[PDB]
């Protein structure tokens, strides 16, 4: 029962102490392609770059660079692609990546506008009849239907490869009430969203990895993937107490820098993994409590 290490830290009050330790121990690999000059305009922030060893490559002969990272959690047996909020000029690259990696879901954890700061381009069509065409990468993108909820929206999109005319369905899960450098309203809000993603099938291994992004692709994105992975391990090992959250985060940081951006996001990660273990322990009906408790209707 890792609720001990939690109450111990909250009474002790040393969350920032523990958060800073992870910054100090976290890996540090070269980001050489990210830093080339021809790629200055493909990065949203100049202190956030993918490691050369885990960066996604576009299947382009000219410039294969995009600010995205493959996070391959070997033991948990799940891969994720964490990327930045696409830029006005990288929307085509984003969906090219989605196509080439065979992803089936995109999880977006920011809003296009956040406290007056433009955190992301409008890279998916908001109206059924106004579909997007990315001519640089030969892709067409069409809203098919959408399911709006209190604090999140699920969209069904059709991505077409204009060359082969092949088409695929992509599920877009948009969390709308998660503030930059902040935390979700409650663990139930988060876990209801996470399990909505799980149930959709987007995380299945017959699909390419799910694409997860916020603004920089490290803070809210890191919290999301950390919780999902810890619950996977909890279940794989078949033992809630065994999972060391700090150790899983440092494994994830071997693949992309900066995952989890504040001490409060790390504490929420503990809170979320602690709550979710109820489901893994066999209390499958806690899931419906999360749905009721998240006010997802309104």
């Amino acid at each position: 029962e890792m609720e001990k290490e939690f109450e111990q830290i909250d009474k002790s009050g040393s969350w920032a102490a523990i958060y800073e330790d992870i910054r100090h121990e976290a890996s540090d690999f070269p980001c050489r392609v990210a830093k080339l000059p021809k790629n200055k305009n493909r990065n949203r922030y100049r202190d956030v770059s993918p490691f050369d060893h885990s960066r996604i490559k576009l299947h382009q002969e000219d410039n294969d660079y995009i600010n995205a990272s493959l996070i391959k959690m070997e033991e948990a047996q799940r891969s994720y692609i964490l990327t930045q909020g696409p830029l006005p000029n990288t929307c085509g690259h984003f969906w090219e990546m989605v196509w080439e990696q065979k992803s089936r879901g995109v999880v977006m954890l920011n809003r296009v506008m956040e406290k007056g700061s433009l955190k992301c381009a409008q890279y998916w069509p908001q109206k059924e009849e106004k579909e997007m065409i990315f001519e640089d990468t030969n892709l067409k993108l069409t809203l098919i239907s959408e399911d709006i909820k209190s604090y999140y929206t699920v969209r069904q999109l059709e991505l077409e490869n204009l060359t082969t005319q092949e088409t695929r369905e992509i599920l877009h899960f948009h969390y709308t009430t998660w503030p930059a450098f902040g935390v979700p309203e409650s663990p139930a809000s988060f876990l209801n969203f996470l399990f909505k993603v799980r149930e959709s099938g987007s995380l299945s291994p017959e699909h390419g990895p799910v694409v997860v992004h916020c603004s920089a692709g490290i803070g809210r994105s890191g919290t999301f993937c950390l919780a999902d992975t810890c619950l996977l391990l909890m279940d794989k090992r078949k033992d809630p107490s065994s999972v060391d959250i700090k150790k899983v985060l440092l494994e994830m940081r071997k693949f992309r820098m900066g995952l989890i951006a504040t001490a409060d996001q790390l504490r929420f990660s503990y809170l979320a993994v602690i709550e979710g273990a109820k489901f893994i322990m066999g209390d499958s009906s806690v899931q419906d409590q999360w749905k009721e408790l998240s006010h997802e209707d309104l």
Binding site: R44, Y45, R46, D47, V48, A216, I218
Partner: peptide, 4 residues
Amino acid sequence: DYYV
């Protein structure tokens, strides 16, 4: 245009 910095993160931190």
